[PDB]
């Protein structure tokens, strides 16, 4: 699997590690693929670069 998250800049390295641990677990459990088989990238930007509702 390959997972990406585009999100506002500002989260701590600890929060990012929590994010990845959760996403890796849930994707791994749903697909049945080992955590080592799931790639994850976080892409960050400032607020002018996001329109969220």
């Amino acid at each position: 699997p390959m997972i990406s998250c585009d999100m506002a800049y500002g989260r701590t390295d600890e929060q990012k590690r929590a994010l990845s641990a959760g996403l890796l677990r849930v994707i791994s459990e749903a697909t049945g693929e080992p955590r080592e088989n799931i790639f994850f990238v976080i892409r960050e930007g400032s607020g002018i670069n996001f329109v969220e509702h």
């Binding site: 390959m2 998250c5 994010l19 459990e29 749903a30």
Partner: protein, 57 residues
């Protein structure tokens, strides 16, 4: 946030729906995002179209 997940085809509709529910929950718990700004895209692919760990299906 926008979480895009590329997985192999093969899961039930029920399983994918649970996966999207689980992605939302995890995102909210870990980085504090209101579910109202959490957007999820699940994309399924044939195994031949993907390589993980350099492996050709």
């Amino acid at each position: 946030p926008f979480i895009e997940c590329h997985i192999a085809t093969g899961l039930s509709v029920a399983r994918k729906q649970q996966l999207i529910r689980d992605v939302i929950d995890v995102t909210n718990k870990s980085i504090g995002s209101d579910p109202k700004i959490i957007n999820v895209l699940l994309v399924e692919h044939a195994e031949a179209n993907m390589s993980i760990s350099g492996r050709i299906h």
